[PDB]
Structures are given as C-alpha cells and as structure tokens.
C-alpha cells in the first residue's frame, strides 16, 4: 500500500455523468497495482440497472484464486457529478468513490483517496466497454491523464486479459 505525505487532493468534480451507459460487461483496462492487489486482475464487471442504482457482479482474480463479487452502487446527490456508492460482497464492504473522466459511452476513470500516519493512499482505476481500449476513447484516456491533479499516468498497469489463468 503506497502513501503520499499530505491530505488528498481537493478534485474537481465532473458536471455530465451519466448513469444510463452503465450496463452489460465492462472491462477494469487498467489500474493502480494497489488496486490490482486489493480487488484483483483480470477484472470486469457486468451491471444491471434496477431503477436509480446499479447491480455489479464483478469477476477477478485476488491472490491467485478467482472471485465473483455481488454488489451495488448509487448515485449520491445529484447523479450528475459523478459521486458513487458502492457495495462489495464477503463480507460486505461499502464506500464512496467519485468518476475523475468520462465520455459517457465508452470509459470511465474512477477515483478513491484515503487519508493519522501523515498521509494518503489513492486508488485509480479504469473500465471501458471494450476489452480493449483503441482510438477515440483511448485518446480522450490519454488526456485527461496529463492535467489529473491525482493521475500518474506513468503508474497504471494496463490489463492483459489474454494468459488471466
């Protein structure tokens, strides 16, 4: 687990989110390797919506041995600014994470920093639609990497859903 002196970075939060694009499969491309650790490679995700929230049943591998993970998540406020709930069953575990980027239809970047040692872990990660990521949303990925008050894009470890057991 990596910790970086100080409190989380203040974020500035998206205005467009759209919780519509959330269903069938999607494929967690890349992440932090705490994350990789902490919730598993070669993960992906199957969501259901079920009205204003969504239901996750979310495949990978977690120290060695594979995992199904039965969850939800909702939108906090106004579903717009990207702000999720989310639960993760196990032993049921719950949170709140905040979407960094989207194009609303093909990737999203999801965001958790977490702060007395004098500091705070962050976990970023990304899913697209497609097992992988080309063109369009790969450029738009490439991008908002560059401004991310919190993104190093150097540190993401891009998925190879290819050996995955």
């Given at each position: 687990?990596?910790?970086?002196?100080?409190?989380?970075?203040?974020?500035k939060?998206?205005?467009?989110?759209?919780?519509?694009?959330?269903?069938?499969?999607?494929?967690?491309v890349?992440?932090?390797?705490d994350?990789?650790?902490k919730?598993?490679?070669?993960?992906?995700?199957?969501?259901?919506?079920?009205?204003?929230?969504?239901?996750?049943?979310?495949?990978?591998?977690?120290?060695?041995?594979?995992?199904?993970?039965?969850?939800?998540?909702?939108?906090?406020?106004?579903?717009?600014?990207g702000?999720?709930?989310?639960?993760?069953?196990?032993?049921?575990?719950?949170?709140?994470?905040?979407?960094?980027?989207?194009?609303?239809?093909?990737?999203?970047?999801g965001?958790?920093?977490?702060?007395?040692?004098?500091?705070?872990?962050?976990?970023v990660?990304?899913?697209?639609?497609?097992?992988?990521?080309?063109?369009?949303?790969?450029?738009?990925?490439?991008?908002?990497?560059i401004?991310?008050?919190?993104?190093?894009?150097?540190?993401?470890?891009y998925?190879?859903?290819?050996?995955?057991?």
């Open positions: 687990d990596v910790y970086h002196d100080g409190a989380c970075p203040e974020v939060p998206v205005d467009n989110f759209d919780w519509s694009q959330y269903h069938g499969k999607w494929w967690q890349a992440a932090y390797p994350h990789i650790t919730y598993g490679k070669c993960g992906w995700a199957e969501y259901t919506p079920e009205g204003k929230s969504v239901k996750v049943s979310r495949y990978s591998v977690i120290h060695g041995k594979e995992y199904f993970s039965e969850g939800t998540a909702y939108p906090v406020g106004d579903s717009k600014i702000k999720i709930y989310h639960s993760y069953t196990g032993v049921t575990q719950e949170g709140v994470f905040n979407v960094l980027s989207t194009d609303n239809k093909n990737y999203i970047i965001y958790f920093c977490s702060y007395d040692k004098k500091g705070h872990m962050d976990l990660w990304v899913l697209s639609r497609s097992m992988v990521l080309t063109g369009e949303a790969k450029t738009a990925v490439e991008n908002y990497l401004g991310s008050p919190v993104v190093d894009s150097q540190k993401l470890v998925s190879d859903f290819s050996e995955c057991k």
